[PDB]
Every structure is written in structure tokens, then in C-alpha cells.
Amino acid sequence: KSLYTNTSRKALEEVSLKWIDTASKFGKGRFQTPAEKHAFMGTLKKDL
Amino acid sequence: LKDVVTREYTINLHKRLHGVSFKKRAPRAVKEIKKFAKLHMGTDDVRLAPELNQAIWKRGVKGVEYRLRLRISRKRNEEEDAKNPLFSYVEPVLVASAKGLQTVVVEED
RNA sequence: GUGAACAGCCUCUAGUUGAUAGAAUAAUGUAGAUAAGGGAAGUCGGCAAAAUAGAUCCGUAACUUCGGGAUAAGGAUUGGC
RNA sequence: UUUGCUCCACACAAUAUAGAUGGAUACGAAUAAGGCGUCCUUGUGGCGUCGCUGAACCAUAGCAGGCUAGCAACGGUGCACUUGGCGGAAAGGCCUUGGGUGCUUGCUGGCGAAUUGCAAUGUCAUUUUGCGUGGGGAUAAAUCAUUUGUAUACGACUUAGAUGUACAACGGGGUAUUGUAAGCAGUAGAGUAGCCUUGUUGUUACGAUCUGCUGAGAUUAAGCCUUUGUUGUCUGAUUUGU
Ligand SMILES: [Mg+2]
Ligand SMILES: [Mg+2]
Ligand SMILES: [Mg+2]
Ligand SMILES: [Mg+2]
Ligand SMILES: [Mg+2]
Ligand SMILES: [Mg+2]
Ligand SMILES: [Mg+2]
Ligand SMILES: [Mg+2]
Ligand SMILES: [Mg+2]
Ligand SMILES: [Mg+2]
Ligand SMILES: [Mg+2]
Ligand SMILES: [Mg+2]
Ligand SMILES: [Mg+2]
Ligand SMILES: [Mg+2]
Ligand SMILES: [Mg+2]
Ligand SMILES: [Mg+2]
Ligand SMILES: [Mg+2]
Ligand SMILES: [Mg+2]
Ligand SMILES: [Mg+2]
Ligand SMILES: [Mg+2]
Ligand SMILES: [Mg+2]
Ligand SMILES: [Mg+2]
Ligand SMILES: [Mg+2]
Ligand SMILES: [Mg+2]
Ligand SMILES: [Mg+2]
Ligand SMILES: [Mg+2]
Ligand SMILES: [Mg+2]
């Protein structure tokens, strides 16, 4: 916890996120969910 | 105890030569493969088949295959007991691709 | 063999595989490379580096001792079948 | 590792000591002001006294302090116990309750001392450390090596390893990179050249390339994530005690 009571305005701003990047970091991630990968690429040679 | 076996292992040479200086990659494989026969069955004294050597050097200093399927027999030492009483003989198993094989006990007869 | 070629690169005959070796990959090095945007603002000074480069066709200034300058410059092209 | 180890008693042989030889004796505060006593209206109060130094207070007599008999006190003091409490600034100490026990120089007696020869030379204090006994007690870890890579020149750092919710080696899945593998097939393909029954699709050879199976195949921890699978592994070395 802070050692002091900051009133930075920058420190009183209540924040609410709109979206959280959830792509792969192990590479240039394109998709957020396995769901989304499917919907976009369609059915592959594996699967079904 | 220490009992004679003979299993068939597939080694990932690639992740072990990853980064190695080209002139040193085949010789690292000989050394790295010895280190592998020692891991399974801490035999310490390891001998390689000269077919394995060829097999390793099959594509030059620089181009060691990413995976090798190996046969490794732990055996009984003969003559004036060179410290430990057991070898590992190592040799190449003929197979199309060394991908996708698990490790297997070879039943001896 | 490629190619203008006794070049460079690869091979045959013949000959070597001989230059202490093992384990790691801190700094700083010696040798080799690459950098977004800018493009000599660096520096005594473009030093170092970079860029150009074969060949075919077109094209080609001042000046000149008429021989040159001149591959001046500036362009297009190039595999395979 | 065979010896061990720990606390308390009293017992020897070493060993050391910045220097025992009646007592380090506890308000706070002011100083052009205070202490102590006493009363009170508990206050910047009233009265009394003190300093002018600790030249004080306390203790001190007994073979380096012996042996012995009594009176008077009901006290003093030492020791080992015991009842309550308080003390954290480094409290490791302080007050308090109950007996027990030795001493008592408060007082009155009976003995002792020499010859250590006229001073040298004489009370033994407390540190450690090893051994000895008798009792109570407790029954681990660190390092080497091997391993991780949140670490690293080497040392060092950080993980892991004795049957596990373990660890490794492989396999699987997810993640990523590239850009569509080998093989087979095509009345795809600029065309040329053969041969026949000379073409309601004529075949045969040669042919960059194209198309399909094929966002296919290859690679993916080496410092990526993950696992109902397979197989394997799991007590070598060394060192340490108040
Ligand atoms: Mg990334
Ligand atoms: Mg590297
Ligand atoms: Mg080679
Ligand atoms: Mg010649
Ligand atoms: Mg050369
Ligand atoms: Mg010669
Ligand atoms: Mg030399
Ligand atoms: Mg640049
Ligand atoms: Mg420019
Ligand atoms: Mg300047
Ligand atoms: Mg300058
Ligand atoms: Mg300048
Ligand atoms: Mg230059
Ligand atoms: Mg460039
Ligand atoms: Mg052309
Ligand atoms: Mg007064
Ligand atoms: Mg007064
Ligand atoms: Mg006094
Ligand atoms: Mg005496
Ligand atoms: Mg102190
Ligand atoms: Mg004297
Ligand atoms: Mg690291
Ligand atoms: Mg697990
Ligand atoms: Mg294993
Ligand atoms: Mg495709
Ligand atoms: Mg699991
Ligand atoms: Mg198992």
C-alpha cells in the first residue's frame, strides 16, 4: 500500500476496462479465444 | 541390483544441439548421445555402434537429424573389471521416420 | 562443370585430415554481419563503411595536341520452358 | 565414521586475566534558587529547619578470625527453601509472605595462639578448556556430487531429488513460424515429334508450369503452456557440538 495519500487526479481516477488482450504472447497472436480461431479459419484437416 | 536390458529410445538431438557451433554439432551429438545412454540406466561406460556414428555424421558436421531412434542394450562387462561391471551398447534402429515413436522394451531371445 | 577464362566456387586422379586438449559463452576485445527515421549534423578530413559492378541494346557534355575525353553521364533488358 | 551430545552439582590437570583486597550507597528539578520536616485549600500555599561539601552514611573487634559455657533480646544477618507481586531501554533484576538453619561483638565467663624466630614469602578472586563421576534430558543437519535457469566469468545465487498431488525421457494436446510437403491424379498446359483402325474426346513420347487431395507439410524449448499415455529413476561422498 502507498506510504501517502495521493490526490494525483491521475490517482483518484476510477477506471473501468473495456477489453483485455488475451491473444498469444508466444508469437503474433491473431485470435482471443479458441472459439474465435475456429469461426475464422473454418474446419481444419484434424477435427471432426 | 543391476539387470541386463535392451530398450529402444528416440532422442531429441535438436533441442540439444540448438545453438551449437556448426563445426561442433556432430561431435556434440556423439557426446550428447553418450550422456543419454547414461541417463537411462546409469551405465557410465558407454560404447557406440560405428553404424550409429555413420548415422550421426550421415549429413556432415553441420546437419545432424533432429531426432534419432536409438537401440540401447545394457550388458555384462568381460575381462579385468574396468571399474563398473556393465556397458551400454548403442545402435541405430532402421525405421522410416523417427517421429511419433514412444520408448519400448525389447524382449530378448 | 559453371564461365571470357590458368578467376572464383564444386569435383576426379594423387595427397593430406597436421597445427595441445576438455567445459562454459561475463566484461572488454580480434575478425565477420545487420539496423527503424535522418543522411556527414560525426571528423583535421567521408577515415572506416556503404553504394556501383557482368552482358546485350539504346544513348552520351564542356574541352582537345583530333588520337582522346568515354564503360563520360543517363536508360531498358537478363530465369525456366 | 566407532568415539557420542545437552543441562545442573562438586572433583582434579592445565590455561588465561589493562589489574578484587569493608560497600558502585538508584527521586526529579531549579541554580537571580532548592532539599528535608510538618500542616493544609494539595497550591507559584502556611510554618520550621538545613547547606557553607562524601572530613558523609553504612559496615567494621573473634586461628585470614578457632574450641567452649550462659544471660538478655524476638532483634540483626548469611544460607538453601517458600507466599505474593512488579521490572522489556540491554527487563536476567527488584520488593514482599511464611517458617527452617548457621552466625550473632547486645551482654558475662572458661580455653587456644609462641619456635613462621626482627620485614621478604601473604586471603584466594574468575576466565576459558580438556578430562572424571550421578542424576535429569534430547535422538539433527550442512557441504561435495547430481539437477533447475527467475542466477552465473570462476566462486556465488536460485530450484529439485528417499515411493510423490514425485522427477526425468519420450509420446499427445494447445501455442507459434513458414505458405501449401512426398505421392497419386487431371479431355490443365505454349507446343513439337511418332504411329495407327485418321479421329462427334484418337492414342504415344517429350513439356516450364498449373489444378486437386492441401491453410497442407516441416519446426515448435533448447529459458513457450499443458498432460488420465508409454518407459525409467529414487540411501554415492564428506563435514559439523554449547
Ligand atoms: Mg512475444
Ligand atoms: Mg546463439
Ligand atoms: Mg560436413
Ligand atoms: Mg595449365
Ligand atoms: Mg576454398
Ligand atoms: Mg608429400
Ligand atoms: Mg601453435
Ligand atoms: Mg539506419
Ligand atoms: Mg537521401
Ligand atoms: Mg563539430
Ligand atoms: Mg572538425
Ligand atoms: Mg563540418
Ligand atoms: Mg576510403
Ligand atoms: Mg543496404
Ligand atoms: Mg524472357
Ligand atoms: Mg524552605
Ligand atoms: Mg511551601
Ligand atoms: Mg549521607
Ligand atoms: Mg589459618
Ligand atoms: Mg549495559
Ligand atoms: Mg618488606
Ligand atoms: Mg536465464
Ligand atoms: Mg505434474
Ligand atoms: Mg529417465
Ligand atoms: Mg493448397
Ligand atoms: Mg495430468
Ligand atoms: Mg511408473
Curated annotation (Swiss-Prot), chain A:
Compartments reported by the entry: Cytoplasm
Gene inactivation effect: A mutant confers resistance to trichodermin, a trichotecene toxin produced by plant-pathogenic fungi.
Source superkingdom: Eukaryota
Role played: Component of the ribosome, a large ribonucleoprotein complex responsible for the synthesis of proteins in the cell. The small ribosomal subunit (SSU) binds messenger RNAs (mRNAs) and translates the encoded message by selecting cognate aminoacyl-transfer RNA (tRNA) molecules. The large subunit (LSU) contains the ribosomal catalytic site termed the peptidyl transferase center (PTC), which catalyzes the formation of peptide bonds, thereby polymerizing the amino acids delivered by tRNAs into a polypeptide chain.
Further comment found in the protein's record: Present with 450 molecules/cell in log phase SD medium.
Family indicated by similarity: Belongs to the universal ribosomal protein uL3 family.
Quaternary organization: Component of the large ribosomal subunit (LSU). Mature yeast ribosomes consist of a small (40S) and a large (60S) subunit. The 40S small subunit contains 1 molecule of ribosomal RNA (18S rRNA) and 33 different proteins (encoded by 57 genes). The large 60S subunit contains 3 rRNA molecules (25S, 5.8S and 5S rRNA) and 46 different proteins (encoded by 81 genes). uL3 forms together with ES39L one of the contact sites for the signal recognition particle that targets ribosomes to the endoplasmic reticulum membrane.
Protein name according to UniProt: Large ribosomal subunit protein uL3
Whole sequence portion shown: 340 to 387 of 387
From Swiss-Prot, chain B:
InterPro entries: Ribosomal_eL31, Ribosomal_eL31_CS, Ribosomal_eL31_dom_sf
Main location: cytoplasm
Keyword Manganese attributed: no
Gene Ontology biological-process entries: cytoplasmic translation; regulation of translational fidelity
SMART domains: Ribosomal_L31e
Single GO term (MF): structural constituent of ribosome
Keywords linked to the UniProt accession: Cytoplasm, Ribonucleoprotein, Ribosomal protein
Subcellular location field: Cytoplasm
GO cellular component, one term: cytosol
Binding partners and assembly: Component of the large ribosomal subunit (LSU). Mature yeast ribosomes consist of a small (40S) and a large (60S) subunit. The 40S small subunit contains 1 molecule of ribosomal RNA (18S rRNA) and 33 different proteins (encoded by 57 genes). The large 60S subunit contains 3 rRNA molecules (25S, 5.8S and 5S rRNA) and 46 different proteins (encoded by 81 genes).
Miscellaneous note of the record: There are 2 genes for eL31 in yeast.
Protein's UniProt name: Large ribosomal subunit protein eL31A
Organism per entry: Saccharomyces cerevisiae (strain ATCC 204508 / S288c) (Baker's yeast)
